[PDB]
Amino acid sequence: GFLSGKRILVTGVASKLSIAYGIAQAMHREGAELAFTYQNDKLKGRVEEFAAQLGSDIVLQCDVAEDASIDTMFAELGKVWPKFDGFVHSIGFAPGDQLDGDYVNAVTREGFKIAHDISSYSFVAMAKACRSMLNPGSALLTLSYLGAERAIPNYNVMGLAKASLEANVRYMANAMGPEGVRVNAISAGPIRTLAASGIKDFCEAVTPIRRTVTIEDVGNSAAFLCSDLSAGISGEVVHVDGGFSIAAM
Amino acid sequence: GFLSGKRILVTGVASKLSIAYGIAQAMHREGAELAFTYQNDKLKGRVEEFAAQLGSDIVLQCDVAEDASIDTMFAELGKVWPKFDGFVHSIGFAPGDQLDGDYVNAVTREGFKIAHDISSYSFVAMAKACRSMLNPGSALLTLSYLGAERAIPNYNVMGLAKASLEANVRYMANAMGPEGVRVNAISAGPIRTLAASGIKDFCEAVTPIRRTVTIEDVGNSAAFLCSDLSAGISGEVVHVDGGFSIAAM
Amino acid sequence: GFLSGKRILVTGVASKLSIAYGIAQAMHREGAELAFTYQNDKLKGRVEEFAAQLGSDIVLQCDVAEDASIDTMFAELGKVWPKFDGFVHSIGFAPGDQLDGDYVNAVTREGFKIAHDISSYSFVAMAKACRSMLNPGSALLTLSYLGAERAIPNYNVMGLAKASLEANVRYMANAMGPEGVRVNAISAGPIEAVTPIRRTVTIEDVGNSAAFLCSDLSAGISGEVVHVDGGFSIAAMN
Amino acid sequence: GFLSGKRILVTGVASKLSIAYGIAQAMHREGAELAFTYQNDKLKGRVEEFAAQLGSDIVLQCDVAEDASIDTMFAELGKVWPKFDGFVHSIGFAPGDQLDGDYVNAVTREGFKIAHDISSYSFVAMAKACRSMLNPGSALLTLSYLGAERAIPNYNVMGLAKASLEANVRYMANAMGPEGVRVNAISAGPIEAVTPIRRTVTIEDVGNSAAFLCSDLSAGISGEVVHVDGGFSIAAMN
């Protein structure tokens, strides 16, 4: 398929409901060789078990809060893939107290710091650590949300972090393009994943396609953006939300 | 390939340099069945000859200035494709006097009217005329340019028309989504085509990928947007300009 | 006030509810000298009454569908204001059939053409017609709506026409900036529980922002679409 | 003037070239009563001199890296202004190493953290700390730059920090709108042949727009990033 001969690292697989899971089955269907990271020991077996289904045995600890963990992870990966063709960054976090109710009351300095570090900085932190391993033609991809561009109740400081993240996409694109690397985001519509219970009160009637997008839709667009078919696209946030953001009333 | 079982009409093939030409070879490579329109008798043989290469014999006159021409064209097409899966709208025009020098001096009421009618209205005019022929899963695609969003010297009233066109993309998406049709645009970076001699003084050093996009890049993104792989994307303007618009200085 | 010294042409007064009417009051308050146009004989008396109440007797016919009507108006204005400081374009139209139901079914070639001509081309037409009359420091203003940027039901082809108008703003700001003329738009909210300010905007609110954008206070702003919609467009799922 | 009746806190004066300094002059001209903060002992005398020249003697230490410094400042302000009408946030910082060369190579976790904390979090921190002190009709303003929206060389992580700040504006406008508080930003140009107005913006131009956005004239505007950059961001390849 259209990713044959590519090697792609995939972060953030937590269950079969994860966006990262849909992106992985899609790139896998399309002929990519895959490798996987997992945040910590609680998810090691699970992620090894999801990896195994997709015929990868490359499954590595990576907590993106830690420079040493990202560095170690890429060192270990370089033993099997001294070069590869990019990564999918599918990782968000803010402490639970940040997303309950009025934004200005819930936000704290520490909550802001963690949300931005894990949801935004980690993307460029991964890029720094593997920059010399990337082939020409490589593509990096992260996931964002409409909360970057609009004030969405309860999403709160995550909206700020995703705005920081989309700006990260542009700065990374502009920096890395000259060495042959593209960097994009998918602004995904809402899907019912493990991380979405963290959000309070979690629209298909006012989406133009009249249904919510699935991890399959998101996965297919992802595969496209990490392939040579999208060689003309970098620094872009592609809305995969069924047209929701372009509608009003 | 990823358009097998799709039938797609392609307008605006004028030479081998046309964006429509790149989109057609790409959809053709990907297993689509194709049909072609041509503006008038001056391009009939040429377009039949380009069609023939791509193994289509469906080649029909269509001047989009004329409701009767669009209606006749779809009547003729319905004899061979009573149903199909969408069309590529790759058609722009403004009289030559519109694009020389200062915008407020060059623009006229008639120039404005023609630019908008041919470059913007024609897209929804085609949609009106074939609406009942479209399958569920159909996708419509037009081509726009950065001149819709920024004041670009000499591009002049075409910038207004392309802004009208991108708004057309949203209104069409929102209207047709409920019956299972998606509608998008590609905002293409500059390529050296037949229509670009019309533009005066026609940047790769400040594009992040450090080269201009080709009709191949544009064609591959096009194919994607008219395929089921992009089923989560409607009402969107995708920038295929190598990241040019997201850079400054 | 912050417009003393300025002479501003105001189009589009049709009633005391008109956006142009709120704009004119606010501009008069801030000390501008005002002149007015009226589309046709049906509105002439209303515009003359309102102009009198503001201390103006410059009240000129202008139908922006006609190049000759625009030229004749500016030749008449020239007799009393050979130079002036810009104008407010507060004009919109599409045939009523364009606004009824599903967009693709309602839009027609003629409806599209009329909507773009009246709602967008007429802004630059006015600018061509008065260009040598503009002082350095001039400011042109037009009025737009969120339907330029989102698909809003029934607003239909008026949305394309507004998107065209917002591009016209940019192209005009770019062309006329070197001669000392700024061009901007207000994207006004409709004149409520999901609006951040928790109320709809009024023609007073619109008027005050329009006065600003036509004054030397806004000298740093050109080519800009300013949202005066209470925060509505930046909120989602409130 | 159009700010008479208003009491506005101004942060970020460091010199007569500071954006905050142009803002304060313009606000004083339009009749506002002013109060000032200063980051540290190095800037205290400059801020006191300037405040004296404007007829103010409210000059309070505030380092926005510290929650305690922000709380203590607002407790001191409360002794003379138990209620007030909003504040201008004119504060930006990243370690100098963040701004040197290729973005990906210069950015570090600590640099990123400091840039976002000082340049974005501190806007809402101030708002939490004074929220019950704000009158209905209040207006918060912050300052941003085009590097929030485009990749500009060397501006590097300050661009992410500004994008965060512009989202903070929206989220804040949404949260505080129901209590009668507006929140906006100015995206200022750098303080020229491809700028539509054919000159860079001045701190006077910025000041006048900031005075507007903090006055009841802008009552219809909230959650908005207004570009005061002479049209620069809407032009291409001039």
Ligand SMILES: NC(=O)c1ccc[n+]([C@@H]2O[C@H](COP(=O)([O-])OP(=O)(O)OC[C@H]3O[C@@H](n4cnc5c(N)ncnc54)[C@H](O)[C@@H]3O)[C@@H](O)[C@H]2O)c1
């Ligand atoms: N599900 C939706 O509706 C939706 C919509 C738009 C965007 N997104 C985004 O898509 C991405 C994937 O989210 P999801 O819904 O698939 O959720 P998920 O809960 O399946 O995935 C979140 C993942 O991030 C990982 N992660 C968190 N902290 C980490 C750390 N310190 N180190 C390493 N990994 C860490 C978790 O272990 C988990 O694998 C996120 O960026 C989320 O914001 C989700």
Ligand SMILES: NC(=O)c1ccc[n+]([C@@H]2O[C@H](COP(=O)([O-])OP(=O)(O)OC[C@H]3O[C@@H](n4cnc5c(N)ncnc54)[C@H](O)[C@@H]3O)[C@@H](O)[C@H]2O)c1
């Ligand atoms: N080439 C570029 O750099 C570039 C960049 C961005 C967008 N675009 C857009 O892409 C599209 C294709 O342009 P191109 O550069 O491939 O040019 P081209 O000159 O090869 O194609 C323009 C086509 O439009 C057709 N057309 C014009 N008037 C017509 C009418 N009345 N009826 C039917 N067809 C009509 C012409 O016959 C021709 O086939 C246009 O919308 C153009 O604005 C071009």
Ligand SMILES: NC(=O)c1ccc[n+]([C@@H]2O[C@H](COP(=O)([O-])OP(=O)(O)OC[C@H]3O[C@@H](n4cnc5c(N)ncnc54)[C@H](O)[C@@H]3O)[C@@H](O)[C@H]2O)c1
């Ligand atoms: N009312 C709202 O909620 C709202 C919101 C956003 C934008 N707008 C825009 O504000 C502007 C003013 O609208 P309004 O609500 O004040 O409506 P209104 O009907 O009071 O004013 C419309 C005006 O346009 C004039 N006009 C129409 N065709 C014309 C022609 N051929 N020549 C000259 N004048 C012509 C009419 O005479 C009338 O004065 C319009 O551009 C409208 O699109 C309205």
Ligand SMILES: NC(=O)c1ccc[n+]([C@@H]2O[C@H](COP(=O)([O-])OP(=O)(O)OC[C@H]3O[C@@H](n4cnc5c(N)ncnc54)[C@H](O)[C@@H]3O)[C@@H](O)[C@H]2O)c1
């Ligand atoms: N100067 C320009 O061309 C330009 C253009 C666009 C935006 N901006 C923005 O305008 C704002 C003001 O910048 P400026 O050009 O006036 O610079 P300036 O250096 O005069 O002002 C920066 C101010 O930030 C203050 N500051 C830094 N860290 C702080 C802390 N911990 N606590 C409290 N105060 C702190 C400094 O004391 C200083 O007063 C900034 O947000 C800057 O990003 C500047």
Ligand SMILES: N#Cc1cc(Br)ccc1Oc1ccc(Cl)cc1O
């Ligand atoms: N990853 C992740 C995640 C963590 C927190 Br805490 C909050 C939301 C998260 O993902 C989302 C889930 C759902 C939506 Cl709509 C957006 C998201 O960014």
Ligand SMILES: N#Cc1cc(Br)ccc1Oc1ccc(Cl)cc1O
């Ligand atoms: N199609 C077409 C076309 C017609 C005119 Br007249 C002007 C430009 C045209 O296409 C473009 C060529 C080049 C660029 Cl960069 C943009 C365009 O829209």
Ligand SMILES: N#Cc1cc(Br)ccc1Oc1ccc(Cl)cc1O
């Ligand atoms: N003027 C005007 C106008 C004409 C038509 Br037909 C449709 C709408 C018009 O004005 C508006 C009224 C209300 C809103 Cl919300 C937006 C508008 O553009």
Ligand SMILES: N#Cc1cc(Br)ccc1Oc1ccc(Cl)cc1O
């Ligand atoms: N304040 C401030 C500031 C601090 C750093 Br470090 C970098 C830039 C800063 O201000 C600016 C100066 C100039 C411009 Cl163009 C934009 C700015 O944000």
